[PDB]
Amino acid sequence: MGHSKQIRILLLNEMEKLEKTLFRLEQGYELQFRLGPTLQGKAVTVYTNYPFPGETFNREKFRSLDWENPTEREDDSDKYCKLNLQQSGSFQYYFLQGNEKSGGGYIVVDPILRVGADNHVLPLDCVTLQTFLAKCLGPFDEWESRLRVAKESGYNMIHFTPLQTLGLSRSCYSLANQLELNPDFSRPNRKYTWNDVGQLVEKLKKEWNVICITDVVYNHTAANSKWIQEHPECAYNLVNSPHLKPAWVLDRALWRFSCDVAEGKYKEKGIPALIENDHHMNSIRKIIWEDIFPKLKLWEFFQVDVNKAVEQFRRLLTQENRRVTKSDPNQHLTIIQDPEYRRFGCTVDMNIALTTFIPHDKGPAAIEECCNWFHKRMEELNSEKHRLINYHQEQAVNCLLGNVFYERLAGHGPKLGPVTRKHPLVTRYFTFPFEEIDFSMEESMIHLPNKACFLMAHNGWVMGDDPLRNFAEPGSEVYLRRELICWGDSVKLRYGNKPEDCPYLWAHMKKYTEITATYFQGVRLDNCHSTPLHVAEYMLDAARNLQPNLYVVAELFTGSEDLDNVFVTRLGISSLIREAMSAYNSHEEGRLVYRYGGEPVGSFVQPCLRPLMPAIAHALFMDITHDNECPIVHRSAYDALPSTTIVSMACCASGSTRGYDELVPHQISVVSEERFYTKWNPEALPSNTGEVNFQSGIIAARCAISKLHQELGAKGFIQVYVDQVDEDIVAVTRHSPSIHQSVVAVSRTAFRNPKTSFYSKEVPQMCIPGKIEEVVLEARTIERNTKPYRKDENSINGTPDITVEIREHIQLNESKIVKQAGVATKGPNEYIQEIEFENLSPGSVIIFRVSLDPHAQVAVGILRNHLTQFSPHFKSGSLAVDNADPILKIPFASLASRLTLAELNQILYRCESEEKEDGGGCYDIPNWSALKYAGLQGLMSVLAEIRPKNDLGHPFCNNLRSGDWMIDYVSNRLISRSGTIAEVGKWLQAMFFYLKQIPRYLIPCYFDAILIGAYTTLLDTAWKQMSSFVQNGSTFVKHLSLGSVQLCGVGKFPSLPILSPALMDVPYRLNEITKEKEQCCVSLAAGLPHFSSGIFRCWGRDTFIALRGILLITGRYVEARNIILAFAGTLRHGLIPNLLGEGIYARYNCRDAVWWWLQCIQDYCKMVPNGLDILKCPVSRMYPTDDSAPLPAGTLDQPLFEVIQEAMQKHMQGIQFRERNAGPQIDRNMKDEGFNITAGVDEETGFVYGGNRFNCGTWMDKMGESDRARNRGIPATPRDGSAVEIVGLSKSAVRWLLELSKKNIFPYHEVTVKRHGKAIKVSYDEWNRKIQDNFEKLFHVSEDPSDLNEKHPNLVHKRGIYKDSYGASSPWCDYQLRPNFTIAMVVAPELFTTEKAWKALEIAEKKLLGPLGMKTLDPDDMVYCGIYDNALDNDNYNLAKGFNYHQGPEWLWPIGYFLRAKLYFSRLMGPETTAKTIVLVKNVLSRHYVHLERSPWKGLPELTNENAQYCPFSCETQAWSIATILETLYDL
């Protein structure tokens, strides 16, 4: 069986502790350790106690696992260590944060069981536990009959009571000596030892495949035994804990008083009468109190303590050589551990009292005052302690009185009656075999450790507090509550804090436990919540070491599941037992059945690679218990069948004891029983008292139930379904996802007796969907004539007047009890069958094996084959086909070879372009309003949050299952286009037609499965059609590339200009409206919002840098060449238009984006190898706009070298045009007054300036149209002069030109610019030297008081900052801290020094950087605003009409460049800062990944304000915000 490997991903974080979360993984499952999203950039070591295979397991030994990188890079995103578990245990794993502990966890592995000689694996879903008692088993020789009876009953598991010597109490779980066989289970003729028992057990297991489970007792033992004869250290004694002396004294006094009262002494004074429904309870309580109160000697103890204290004070005298230590002023004088030290020799510390009160002087008066004050303080403390303990004593007395009243007036109690010596009213807390204290031997008894060592103690539990607390702690107060309940033979066992106290006793107990383990494979835990954890852990560890496979079963009554989960994680409990008696009606029983495991019918398929999720501990659905009232006497006798048919159909487990096979009218008591069992005798017997046959009335039904449960467990049914309409309509409808078969069982009324309680003949009619094929179960209960039941003093016999008949393989037509009323068709694809109830007696159950429609199996088979043809996740599930589709053989494999970006990025999600351009009436979340239009990621976000929790009740699932209009809408949208889109739409339509013949309307599961498959194939074929960079990197790079690719799209109206016909690889398409062939070039834009649609889909520098990023990361060389050619053709006067209207529209209001284009083309040329063949290629300009309308292209094909030379010449000379057909009659915010065309080009300085007061040349546009907030006149905040980055771009361009000219490339260094009538032949080398000198001189502001040759030193706000706009302008335009200098050093770091620039960067980056990005303004600025709200309209000037756009809000494109510059500087500076830069970069990308994980639009938000606000006002995704991240990822 080649099962697919399962890999689990576990994330560890320091913000929480994983100590109560289930971590159950079997041997087949593989567990992987991940660094974690918040632990990126840090190195940690993982330590585990799991031993190497083939070696002994050591708990205290830990090992370290190395880290392996599959990508062989330094990235920590993908770093996991292999861990293949191959053993069952409680191994603990933890990781160290360098040198300090941070956290850990526990791993639980289930065990395995071998059945028979074949050692076949038995799943834990068809095990029927059977309880057997050794006392009821009789002699050891008479064991074959009981085993045969159990085998015929149909139980594969038998619980065996351990065979050991017992005490005189003859009670279970009271073993005396666990070293030899019980003398009772033996005969003088033949003696059986442990070897005989072991060989009998192994023979039974081999020949009858029966597994036996034994019991181990550690917290109690028999009072009298031969185990302890000379060593009293085995049990807790008074010498071990002498602080509980008053408790022992009070217990002995109470026992003596009770014994005296019982023996005819306290009768003349008065004896209370029988307790009745009157005021006698108050009189009894008063008569009890009037003797209980004088019994206590608290006053005597207080007076003797006062006497001893005053005697010690008188004996003590002042010492001249007195040392006083500085005590804590907040400390208070308190007395603790008073009974810890015995009287007449106790030592106490007086220094606390001395420090508390400071004497005035050394005179006698001061000493007397101090001693009087100390005496008063100690008296007040004693009075307060007495008052505090009086309430506790009163509460304990009241609790004891209430408990004794309940015991004496218990309806369900034993009701012994008169109080006798054999059955005392109050059980003795402690046993004192020696004579009680009468006159004066108490003092001798106290001062005698030798005699006190032999003292024995008992153990008990109280159901009023958590028993997890250790009872061996000093100063225990639980015993003082007087609420302990203990047996007459149980003795407490003490093990000590550490095993080293009694090594021989621990070794003997370990040997006994290992002997039990090797003699009995199974084991069980009783009262595990009270025994100390260390000893039990040690014994389980030893058992696991000796026996590789062991089964542990335990039960707890803590109520909440947290304690059970923590106990399972710590100890390693694999099975749990839950009582079914808590259900008093059908509703609670159905709720218990539904909640005890299972899943609702209809679910998707979990991915193979999924994160680890908490599980649910296995539980056993026991029918009845051996320590509770029998359901037979309390309820009706016909309730056994519904209980069996409910526990058989349960999805967790099943089981019953010997008390359910026979419906005896009595309750079996373990404490009082002498009768044996019934010998096996197959038929040939009247079956009166002990000669029952193989199966008469209950055995056949039980065998059928067990067989049905085993068949259900072997089939593999996990689904459950419970519905309730009336009082008794409970049914189970488990459905198999593989073969699609559902079995429905219908019960009847059994809680109320038909004779005792009146019933109505008319019953509601239930309609069962589908057609019934075969009735697998048919039980009818009737009343016959038989002799009346009589009590037997030798054995136990059930009631013979009740019997049922079973039937198997009976057709519906041949059935004489039920009939088919008819066939009802409530829907075109819904089949409903009507069944009429005619002679269905109450208490009779019947199970219907319904079948699906005839035209369903073939459809399910072909659907499963199609699903499994994509991935091997679906094991098997293949059905033979008749003809299928011979034409369709590779629906997706063929489409992998041929792929294009335009078609792939047109039907991805249809987020908003399709709706905004055509409209389709999309209905989003019909219940509420409109939330998620069409996005698959939108539903995936909810699915990934509900799948681990298995929450199928979400409204989204309800509205998905309500209708299938989403499928029709998706198909209609997909078949809208033609070509490959039409082919895939037809394929999905054919698949939908194929899957439209299924019942139960579970279509959304198959839709999700096929969507997952299609997404997987799309991701694969996109990964293959990509460069060799994303594969080497982590999954973050692949996700970023996929997001960048999916961002682009093509609408109905093209936005890019029409390319020249001479261009190669020009996409074309036919318009659906104009029926004309138009270019379908992809235009890049910052998302697809409603603000921009076609006309606004194109921009300037942002789109340019975005396209540079995408087409230099992916590797689209031809697309980049086409874009460059189009930009060169549309270029006018060497200036970027910045706005293309596909016609006469042109807005040449900016002089930027030219140096950016030059840098982009230069890096594209330098990155592509052998790129010299593209510089000489012909260029066909298509948009000549100089003095008239542009002419059609193709007139000339001049090289771009002359074009760029002419552009440079025009830029150097200057451009002074006018009326560039911009803003003819439209003006909203921009003001067109005065002269504003182009300013710059300054001689003798080597710098370029620009900008006007009324004209903005930068990319700043933010203003309000409100009259109150009217801020017109100055458009935004223009930066007159040099813009920092422009100087760096020009320096890089001239350096590249000089480098090219040095190698005979571009031999036009000479410049023929003539001004004022004279021509100058200045080369770029002199200009480069001049600009370098200017950068090294002017931009070298020193914080220290130097550089006297400076202008306006006091005008700058502070020293050490970099000017943003050099020149003469307003002081509030360049004296701000902005990240505009990062680009200048990125393009050319030669100008910036290796020391001054580094220090400036460090001093700038001190409080600017935030969780996601650095603030646009320094925090100390008085105009900084960390909260941005455009819709808000307040009186604040900076918060009016969004005036704080660049005053605190953090963008995304400024970041990344700073990190790259810092890493580049650290690389050349020293290795010390390289590690810090790497850690910071890793943290930044980890935070970015964390933020992008919870992105419904899968895009980077643009309004990341303070406190991580939601619902950004601007676009939620930008095209220009990913290029910087991609470049940073490429760098490192």
Tab-separated table of N, CA and C in Angstrom, residues 338-436:
chain	number	residue	atom	x	y	z
A	338	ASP	N	4.018	26.357	62.470
A	338	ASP	CA	3.940	26.150	63.916
A	338	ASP	C	4.050	24.682	64.316
A	339	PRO	N	3.334	23.734	63.701
A	339	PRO	CA	3.499	22.330	64.093
A	339	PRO	C	4.711	21.647	63.480
A	340	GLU	N	5.528	22.367	62.706
A	340	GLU	CA	6.712	21.755	62.109
A	340	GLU	C	7.712	21.325	63.174
A	341	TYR	N	7.903	22.149	64.200
A	341	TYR	CA	8.831	21.853	65.282
A	341	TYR	C	8.056	21.395	66.510
A	342	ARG	N	8.504	20.295	67.112
A	342	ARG	CA	7.837	19.755	68.284
A	342	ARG	C	8.069	20.651	69.500
A	343	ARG	N	7.187	20.508	70.486
A	343	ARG	CA	7.285	21.291	71.706
A	343	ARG	C	8.475	20.828	72.545
A	344	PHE	N	8.824	21.650	73.538
A	344	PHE	CA	9.941	21.386	74.445
A	344	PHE	C	11.250	21.228	73.668
A	345	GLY	N	11.648	22.314	73.011
A	345	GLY	CA	12.858	22.314	72.211
A	345	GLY	C	12.706	23.066	70.905
A	346	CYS	N	11.518	23.616	70.666
A	346	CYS	CA	11.275	24.382	69.453
A	346	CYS	C	12.091	25.670	69.459
A	347	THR	N	12.570	26.061	68.281
A	347	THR	CA	13.385	27.256	68.114
A	347	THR	C	12.664	28.233	67.196
A	348	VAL	N	12.620	29.502	67.603
A	348	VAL	CA	11.974	30.555	66.833
A	348	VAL	C	12.934	31.731	66.720
A	349	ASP	N	12.685	32.578	65.725
A	349	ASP	CA	13.522	33.740	65.452
A	349	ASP	C	12.860	34.984	66.031
A	350	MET	N	13.559	35.652	66.948
A	350	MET	CA	13.067	36.871	67.575
A	350	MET	C	13.559	38.135	66.883
A	351	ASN	N	14.493	38.015	65.935
A	351	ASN	CA	15.070	39.195	65.296
A	351	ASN	C	14.021	40.013	64.552
A	352	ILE	N	12.966	39.366	64.052
A	352	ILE	CA	11.900	40.099	63.372
A	352	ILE	C	11.210	41.052	64.341
A	353	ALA	N	10.901	40.565	65.546
A	353	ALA	CA	10.287	41.421	66.556
A	353	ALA	C	11.234	42.533	66.991
A	354	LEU	N	12.526	42.222	67.116
A	354	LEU	CA	13.502	43.240	67.498
A	354	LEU	C	13.590	44.339	66.447
A	355	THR	N	13.564	43.967	65.166
A	355	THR	CA	13.603	44.969	64.107
A	355	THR	C	12.294	45.744	64.013
A	356	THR	N	11.167	45.102	64.336
A	356	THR	CA	9.875	45.772	64.225
A	356	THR	C	9.759	46.938	65.201
A	357	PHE	N	10.197	46.748	66.444
A	357	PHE	CA	10.090	47.765	67.484
A	357	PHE	C	11.487	48.202	67.899
A	358	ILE	N	11.744	49.501	67.827
A	358	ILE	CA	13.040	50.076	68.176
A	358	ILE	C	12.938	50.652	69.584
A	359	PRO	N	13.674	50.122	70.561
A	359	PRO	CA	13.608	50.679	71.917
A	359	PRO	C	14.140	52.103	71.961
A	360	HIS	N	13.558	52.902	72.858
A	360	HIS	CA	13.977	54.294	72.993
A	360	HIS	C	15.416	54.396	73.483
A	361	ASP	N	15.787	53.578	74.462
A	361	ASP	CA	17.132	53.597	75.025
A	361	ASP	C	17.415	52.228	75.634
A	362	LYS	N	18.504	52.139	76.396
A	362	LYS	CA	18.900	50.903	77.055
A	362	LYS	C	18.406	50.810	78.493
A	363	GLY	N	17.619	51.779	78.952
A	363	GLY	CA	17.118	51.777	80.306
A	363	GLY	C	16.071	50.707	80.533
A	364	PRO	N	15.841	50.354	81.801
A	364	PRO	CA	14.826	49.328	82.102
A	364	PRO	C	13.429	49.702	81.639
A	365	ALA	N	13.077	50.990	81.670
A	365	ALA	CA	11.752	51.406	81.220
A	365	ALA	C	11.556	51.117	79.737
A	366	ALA	N	12.574	51.396	78.920
A	366	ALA	CA	12.473	51.120	77.490
A	366	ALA	C	12.342	49.625	77.223
A	367	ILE	N	13.101	48.805	77.953
A	367	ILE	CA	13.015	47.357	77.782
A	367	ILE	C	11.632	46.855	78.177
A	368	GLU	N	11.092	47.369	79.286
A	368	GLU	CA	9.753	46.971	79.710
A	368	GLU	C	8.704	47.378	78.683
A	369	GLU	N	8.817	48.592	78.139
A	369	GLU	CA	7.873	49.031	77.117
A	369	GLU	C	7.965	48.156	75.872
A	370	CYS	N	9.186	47.820	75.449
A	370	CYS	CA	9.358	46.979	74.270
A	370	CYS	C	8.783	45.586	74.491
A	371	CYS	N	9.027	44.999	75.667
A	371	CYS	CA	8.502	43.664	75.938
A	371	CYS	C	6.982	43.679	76.031
A	372	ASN	N	6.409	44.725	76.635
A	372	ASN	CA	4.956	44.842	76.687
A	372	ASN	C	4.363	44.984	75.290
A	373	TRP	N	5.000	45.790	74.435
A	373	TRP	CA	4.519	45.941	73.065
A	373	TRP	C	4.605	44.625	72.301
A	374	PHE	N	5.702	43.885	72.480
A	374	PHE	CA	5.839	42.591	71.817
A	374	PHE	C	4.780	41.608	72.301
A	375	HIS	N	4.512	41.592	73.610
A	375	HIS	CA	3.480	40.711	74.145
A	375	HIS	C	2.106	41.077	73.598
A	376	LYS	N	1.801	42.376	73.525
A	376	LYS	CA	0.522	42.802	72.967
A	376	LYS	C	0.403	42.411	71.499
A	377	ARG	N	1.482	42.589	70.731
A	377	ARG	CA	1.456	42.221	69.319
A	377	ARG	C	1.253	40.722	69.139
A	378	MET	N	1.941	39.907	69.943
A	378	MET	CA	1.790	38.461	69.814
A	378	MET	C	0.402	38.010	70.258
A	379	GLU	N	-0.166	38.662	71.278
A	379	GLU	CA	-1.530	38.344	71.686
A	379	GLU	C	-2.528	38.697	70.592
A	380	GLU	N	-2.350	39.856	69.952
A	380	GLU	CA	-3.228	40.237	68.851
A	380	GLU	C	-3.101	39.265	67.685
A	381	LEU	N	-1.873	38.844	67.370
A	381	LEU	CA	-1.673	37.878	66.294
A	381	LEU	C	-2.335	36.545	66.618
A	382	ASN	N	-2.201	36.080	67.863
A	382	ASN	CA	-2.840	34.830	68.262
A	382	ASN	C	-4.357	34.938	68.188
A	383	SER	N	-4.913	36.070	68.628
A	383	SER	CA	-6.358	36.266	68.547
A	383	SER	C	-6.833	36.282	67.099
A	384	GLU	N	-6.088	36.956	66.219
A	384	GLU	CA	-6.455	36.984	64.807
A	384	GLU	C	-6.393	35.592	64.192
A	385	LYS	N	-5.357	34.819	64.531
A	385	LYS	CA	-5.251	33.456	64.017
A	385	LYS	C	-6.400	32.588	64.518
A	386	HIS	N	-6.759	32.726	65.796
A	386	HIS	CA	-7.877	31.961	66.340
A	386	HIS	C	-9.184	32.333	65.650
A	387	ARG	N	-9.406	33.629	65.419
A	387	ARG	CA	-10.612	34.058	64.718
A	387	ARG	C	-10.641	33.519	63.293
A	388	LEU	N	-9.492	33.528	62.612
A	388	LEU	CA	-9.434	33.018	61.247
A	388	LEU	C	-9.713	31.520	61.197
A	389	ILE	N	-9.159	30.755	62.141
A	389	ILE	CA	-9.351	29.308	62.111
A	389	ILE	C	-10.711	28.890	62.659
A	390	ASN	N	-11.381	29.750	63.430
A	390	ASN	CA	-12.712	29.411	63.924
A	390	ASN	C	-13.702	29.245	62.777
A	391	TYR	N	-13.645	30.139	61.786
A	391	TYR	CA	-14.532	30.022	60.633
A	391	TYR	C	-14.259	28.744	59.853
A	392	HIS	N	-12.982	28.399	59.671
A	392	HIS	CA	-12.640	27.164	58.972
A	392	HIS	C	-13.138	25.942	59.734
A	393	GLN	N	-12.978	25.940	61.060
A	393	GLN	CA	-13.463	24.823	61.863
A	393	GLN	C	-14.979	24.700	61.780
A	394	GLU	N	-15.689	25.831	61.839
A	394	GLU	CA	-17.144	25.799	61.725
A	394	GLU	C	-17.579	25.283	60.359
A	395	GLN	N	-16.905	25.726	59.295
A	395	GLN	CA	-17.235	25.248	57.956
A	395	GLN	C	-16.985	23.751	57.827
A	396	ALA	N	-15.869	23.267	58.378
A	396	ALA	CA	-15.578	21.838	58.326
A	396	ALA	C	-16.612	21.035	59.105
A	397	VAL	N	-17.017	21.532	60.276
A	397	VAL	CA	-18.030	20.841	61.070
A	397	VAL	C	-19.355	20.794	60.321
A	398	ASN	N	-19.746	21.912	59.703
A	398	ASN	CA	-20.990	21.941	58.939
A	398	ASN	C	-20.933	20.988	57.751
A	399	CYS	N	-19.794	20.945	57.054
A	399	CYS	CA	-19.652	20.037	55.921
A	399	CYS	C	-19.728	18.582	56.368
A	400	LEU	N	-19.075	18.248	57.483
A	400	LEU	CA	-19.138	16.883	57.998
A	400	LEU	C	-20.559	16.513	58.406
A	401	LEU	N	-21.271	17.440	59.054
A	401	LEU	CA	-22.652	17.176	59.442
A	401	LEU	C	-23.536	16.964	58.219
A	402	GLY	N	-23.364	17.793	57.188
A	402	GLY	CA	-24.135	17.606	55.968
A	402	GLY	C	-23.830	16.286	55.286
A	403	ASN	N	-22.550	15.906	55.245
A	403	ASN	CA	-22.171	14.641	54.625
A	403	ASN	C	-22.758	13.456	55.382
A	404	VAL	N	-22.698	13.486	56.717
A	404	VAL	CA	-23.243	12.375	57.491
A	404	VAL	C	-24.766	12.336	57.384
A	405	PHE	N	-25.419	13.500	57.298
A	405	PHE	CA	-26.865	13.521	57.103
A	405	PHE	C	-27.245	12.941	55.747
A	406	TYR	N	-26.493	13.287	54.699
A	406	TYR	CA	-26.761	12.729	53.378
A	406	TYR	C	-26.526	11.223	53.356
A	407	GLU	N	-25.453	10.763	54.007
A	407	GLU	CA	-25.163	9.333	54.041
A	407	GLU	C	-26.236	8.565	54.805
A	408	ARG	N	-26.703	9.113	55.930
A	408	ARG	CA	-27.711	8.425	56.729
A	408	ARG	C	-29.096	8.488	56.099
A	409	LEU	N	-29.326	9.414	55.172
A	409	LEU	CA	-30.621	9.593	54.522
A	409	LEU	C	-30.464	9.555	53.008
A	410	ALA	N	-29.729	8.561	52.516
A	410	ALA	CA	-29.495	8.387	51.089
A	410	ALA	C	-30.488	7.372	50.539
A	411	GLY	N	-31.288	7.796	49.559
A	411	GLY	CA	-32.250	6.887	48.958
A	411	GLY	C	-31.591	5.760	48.187
A	412	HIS	N	-30.531	6.072	47.445
A	412	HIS	CA	-29.808	5.082	46.659
A	412	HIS	C	-28.633	4.469	47.410
A	413	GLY	N	-28.430	4.838	48.674
A	413	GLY	CA	-27.333	4.306	49.445
A	413	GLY	C	-27.604	2.900	49.932
A	414	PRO	N	-26.587	2.306	50.561
A	414	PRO	CA	-26.751	0.941	51.090
A	414	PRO	C	-27.854	0.820	52.126
A	415	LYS	N	-28.078	1.861	52.930
A	415	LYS	CA	-29.104	1.868	53.974
A	415	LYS	C	-28.898	0.707	54.950
A	416	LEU	N	-27.738	0.728	55.612
A	416	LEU	CA	-27.413	-0.324	56.571
A	416	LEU	C	-28.372	-0.309	57.755
A	417	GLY	N	-28.711	0.878	58.252
A	417	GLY	CA	-29.625	1.004	59.362
A	417	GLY	C	-28.916	1.309	60.666
A	418	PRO	N	-29.048	0.412	61.642
A	418	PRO	CA	-28.398	0.633	62.938
A	418	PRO	C	-26.881	0.637	62.810
A	419	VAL	N	-26.241	1.421	63.672
A	419	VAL	CA	-24.787	1.529	63.676
A	419	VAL	C	-24.203	0.371	64.474
A	420	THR	N	-23.275	-0.360	63.862
A	420	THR	CA	-22.628	-1.502	64.489
A	420	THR	C	-21.117	-1.338	64.406
A	421	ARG	N	-20.407	-2.194	65.146
A	421	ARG	CA	-18.948	-2.153	65.131
A	421	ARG	C	-18.398	-2.510	63.756
A	422	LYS	N	-18.999	-3.503	63.096
A	422	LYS	CA	-18.527	-3.911	61.777
A	422	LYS	C	-18.748	-2.820	60.735
A	423	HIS	N	-19.809	-2.024	60.884
A	423	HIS	CA	-20.149	-0.953	59.949
A	423	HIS	C	-20.291	0.346	60.733
A	424	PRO	N	-19.177	0.992	61.076
A	424	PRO	CA	-19.259	2.257	61.815
A	424	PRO	C	-19.873	3.361	60.969
A	425	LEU	N	-20.500	4.321	61.656
A	425	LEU	CA	-21.129	5.437	60.958
A	425	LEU	C	-20.094	6.293	60.237
A	426	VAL	N	-18.933	6.501	60.854
A	426	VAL	CA	-17.852	7.286	60.273
A	426	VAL	C	-16.621	6.398	60.163
A	427	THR	N	-16.071	6.297	58.957
A	427	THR	CA	-14.875	5.495	58.743
A	427	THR	C	-13.677	6.128	59.439
A	428	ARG	N	-12.848	5.287	60.052
A	428	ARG	CA	-11.668	5.775	60.753
A	428	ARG	C	-10.649	6.315	59.758
A	429	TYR	N	-10.149	7.524	60.025
A	429	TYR	CA	-9.161	8.128	59.135
A	429	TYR	C	-7.829	7.393	59.206
A	430	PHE	N	-7.439	6.945	60.396
A	430	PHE	CA	-6.163	6.279	60.603
A	430	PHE	C	-6.375	5.015	61.425
A	431	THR	N	-5.450	4.071	61.270
A	431	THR	CA	-5.495	2.795	61.971
A	431	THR	C	-4.435	2.776	63.064
A	432	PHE	N	-4.841	2.378	64.270
A	432	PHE	CA	-3.950	2.297	65.427
A	432	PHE	C	-4.091	0.914	66.046
A	433	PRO	N	-3.304	-0.061	65.583
A	433	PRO	CA	-3.389	-1.409	66.170
A	433	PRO	C	-3.068	-1.447	67.654
A	434	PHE	N	-2.193	-0.566	68.131
A	434	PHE	CA	-1.839	-0.544	69.540
A	434	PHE	C	-2.985	0.031	70.372
A	435	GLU	N	-2.848	-0.092	71.690
A	435	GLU	CA	-3.878	0.388	72.601
A	435	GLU	C	-3.980	1.908	72.552
A	436	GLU	N	-5.203	2.412	72.688
A	436	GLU	CA	-5.445	3.844	72.660
A	436	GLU	C	-4.953	4.501	73.947
